[PDB]
Design a binder for these strands. Structure first.
Ligand SMILES: [Br-]
Ligand SMILES: [Br-]
Length: 759
DNA sequence: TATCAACTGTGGCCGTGGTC
DNA sequence: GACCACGGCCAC
């Protein structure tokens, strides 16, 4: 199984390293024969002799063109001839590529920004994470001595904890009376012990939670201060800390540093991504948090260190358990994209598509378009019309069906062959024509992207079939994750077409997809209304809710099935309308906000405050309770009594502050905010102190008693102390609970004053 | 100098704090 | 007091 590739330099020449795990053994294979290259399109082939002679310099070394070769490729399906320029060392490419492009006989260069070790994986046909090899994993976490206004890592590491299949231990340099704590004499001895643990255990995967941005940088600074070679790499190298945009990421050579935080962030939507929140949401058990201040107090006084050590043990334990839960899936995604787990687990959606496409482009001799320059990028910022959203007939309805398309946008791309290489391609014998926007697509040959998307969807169906039939539980599970990875990829193509930074950006493709989507969903709505007499209550993009007002449940179902038979005989190709489910009652509040209940009692909620992180739990819980009264018990008066009771509890300071926390994400640098709401006001105050705020940080705050600007009396919940603080009960009534439930009960005539407790 | 210069789409409702 | 831009994060 291939884990990763990189290169090193030996007598000036690049040596590719392929890090493998075959049959329980780590291996390094070396390749010295692979040459970096990129392509040049020339105005005339005789200019190659001038281009051959262009030179550059690299730390006092002269950079030359090693050799050239004229080659035939396809560019958006059409034949083209380019010169493949070869070089001795990958760092020659950035030293010389601009000078070659600037040459007047060079129209443009292509494929000049592909990291060499990834170029190697593609051109060699090599695929990481193939096979059933079992990887050895090890989670770790640290606890540190924090004081507020200090430089990063001015304080020592206090404990290092780790966990694997054998359990969890804690190394520390004070005496703690717990069986899983190993005691050494100093911080230095502790770090060296941990390094020895790693080297002896020899894990393939080091699992952290936010180790990209805290743990490794901390260890590095302490190792600098204490004179420690922190040699975690399997080749003896130290961890490699690199900047990727506004974030950091950390490699450990020969291993996979699997930082769960970016993975969980892509995978699950939670209000906060504390380790405690994540563990509870995935596994369903609490995890107690110990705060930095208590940790420091415990260390400075020697008191209650057992609680700190257990917290530290638990960080490592739950980090290992989460790593076991999330890694196999990220592994199948890496295999599908064809790049390393380290990269793929940190990568954005658009980047995964592009890496997949670059590899398939190589296999098909398709020259890759370049990323846009600053001018082109600014041109691409124009937008287009998206999905159809019908204004709901608002209120409570009974005996509802939801019908929606199977993978609407991918079905469209495939059925109508929507691709930049088919877009208005001249001279064909068959075209499909996108409604409203008018773009024609050639049907005579499969477009590059439709062809790949089609192969993907077909593979996913074969996999689902083999899963059902298989008898091997290991294979079944690998198949499950691969089928899940294909769905993710296949559903990413439409947004990639509209992605300004994409190489295969195609605005005409994207707006053709959405125009076809609008035509299909609105055509289908009109058919079920006109030909079967349904009322369409509400519809968003690819599906709709409908019933027959005065009508039995089995009547609505049967007639929905008849309409489906009728409609799918009219739909072309892969377009297919499906029966998603039957809901006994539904409550439609606005566009994109509604809730339904099924026959078994299960409520499903969309768009309402209940699902959002920027609404306090007390508001969410109460709206949830109002909805159940309506949907389940059809009991409006009980809904009012619930609100009245909740608002009275709040005015009596009987609601625990833990239900008053509001979570809002910082999304940019604090200086760039033009308007400052409460979460930014808090963020700015924390930055004022010793606290780094980066995009993606969730500010979790509570509003304290007062009047005027919310932001002047908001504090991080971390710091809430009921002996020093009084929460703003009128705010949680007037700004949180009542607005959330008024928007629902507005439909039955109740105004805010019918919902408040009376003094 | 040892690596991609950066984090997919549009449609929609809402709270805050500012202006007029 | 009426209005609105900014920014949050949802649905698909
Ligand atoms: Br499915
Ligand atoms: Br409560």
């Amino acid at each position: 199984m291939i884990l990763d590739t990189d290169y090193i330099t030996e007598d000036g020449k690049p040596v590719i390293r392929i890090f493998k795990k075959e049959n329980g053994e780590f291996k390094i294979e070396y390749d010295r024969t692979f040459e970096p290259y990129f392509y040049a399109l020339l105005k005339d082939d005789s200019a190659i002799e001038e281009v051959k002679k262009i030179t550059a310099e690299r730390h006092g070394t002269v950079v030359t063109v090693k050799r050239v070769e004229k080659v035939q490729k396809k560019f958006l399906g059409r034949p083209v001839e380019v010169w493949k320029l070869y070089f001795t060392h990958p760092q020659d490419v950035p030293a010389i590529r601009d000078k070659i492009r600037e040459h007047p006989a060079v129209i443009d260069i292509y494929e000049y920004d592909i990291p060499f070790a990834k170029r190697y994986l593609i051109d060699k046909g090599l695929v990481p994470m193939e096979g059933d090899e079992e990887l050895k994993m090890l989670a770790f976490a640290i606890a540190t001595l924090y004081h507020e206004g200090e430089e990063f890592a001015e304080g020592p590491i206090l404990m290092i904890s780790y966990a694997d299949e054998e359990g969890a231990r804690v190394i520390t340099w004070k005496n703690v009376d717990l069986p899983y704590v190993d005691v050494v004499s100093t911080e230095r001895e502790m770090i060296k012990r941990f390094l020895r643990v790693v080297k002896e255990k020899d894990p393939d995967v080091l699992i952290t939670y936010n180790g990209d941005n805290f743990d490794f940088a901390y260890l590095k600074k302490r190792c600098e201060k204490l004179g420690i070679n922190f040699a975690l790499g399997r080749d003896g190298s130290e961890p490699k800390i690199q900047r990727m945009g506004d974030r950091f990421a950390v490699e450990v050579k020969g291993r996979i540093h699997f930082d769960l935080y970016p993975v969980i962030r892509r995978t699950i939507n939670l209000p906060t991504y504390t380790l405690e929140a994540v563990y509870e949401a995935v596994f369903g058990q609490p995890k107690e948090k110990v705060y930095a201040e208590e940790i420091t107090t415990a260390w400075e006084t020697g008191e209650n260190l057992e609680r700190v050590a257990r917290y530290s043990m638990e960080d490592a334990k739950v980090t290992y358990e989460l790593g076991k839960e999330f890694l196999p899936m990220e592994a199948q995604l890496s295999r599908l994209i064809g790049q390393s787990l380290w990269d793929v687990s940190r990568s954005s959606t658009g980047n995964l598509v592009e890496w997949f496409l670059l590899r398939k482009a190589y296999e098909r001799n398709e020259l890759a378009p370049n990323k846009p320059d600053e001018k082109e990028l600014a041109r691409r910022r124009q937008s287009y019309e998206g999905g159809y959203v019908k204004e709901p007939e608002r209120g409570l309805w009974e005996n509802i069906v939801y019908l929606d398309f199977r993978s609407l946008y991918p079905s469209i791309i495939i059925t109508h062959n929507v691709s930049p290489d088919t877009l208005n391609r001249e001279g064909c014998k068959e075209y499909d024509v996108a409604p409203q926007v008018g773009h024609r697509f050639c049907k005579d040959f499969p477009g590059f992207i439709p062809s790949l998307l089609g192969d993907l969807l077909e593979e996913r169906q074969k996999i689902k079939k083999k899963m059902k039939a298989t008898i091997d539980p290991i294979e079944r599970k690998l198949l499950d994750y691969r089928q899940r990875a294909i769905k993710i990829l296949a559903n990413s193509y439409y947004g990639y077409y509209g992605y300004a930074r994409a190489r295969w950006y195609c605005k005409e493709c994207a707006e053709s997809v959405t125009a076809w989507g609008r035509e299909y969903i609105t055509m289908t709505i009109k058919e079920i209304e006109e030909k079967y007499g349904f009322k369409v209550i509400y519809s968003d993009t690819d599906g709709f809710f409908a019933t027959i007002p005065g009508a039995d449940a089995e009547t609505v179902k049967k007639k929905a099935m008849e309409f489906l038979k009728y409609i799918n005989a009219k739909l072309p190709g892969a377009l297919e309308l499906e029966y998603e489910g039957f809901y006994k009652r539904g409550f439609f509040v606005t566009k994109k906000k509604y809730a339904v209940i099924d026959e078994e009692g299960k409520i499903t909620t969309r768009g309402l405050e209940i699902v959002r992180r920027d609404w306090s739990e007390i508001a969410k819980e109460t709206q949830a309770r109002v909805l159940e009264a309506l949907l389940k018990d059809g009991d409006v008066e009980k809904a009012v009594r619930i609100v009245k009771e909740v608002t009275e509890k709040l005015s009596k300071y009987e609601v625990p502050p833990e239900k008053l926390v509001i979570h809002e994400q910082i999304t940019r640098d604090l200086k760039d905010y033009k308007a400052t709401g409460p979460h930014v006001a808090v963020a700015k105050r924390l930055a004022a102190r010793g606290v780094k705020i980066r995009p993606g940080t969730v500010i979790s705050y509570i509003v304290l008693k007062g009047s005027g600007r919310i932001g002047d009396r908001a504090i991080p919940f971390d710091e809430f102390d009921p002996t020093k603080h009084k929460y703003d009960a009128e705010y949680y009534i007037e700004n949180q609970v009542l607005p959330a439930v008024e928007r629902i009960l507005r439909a039955f005539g109740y105004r805010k004053e019918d919902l408040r407790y009376q003094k």
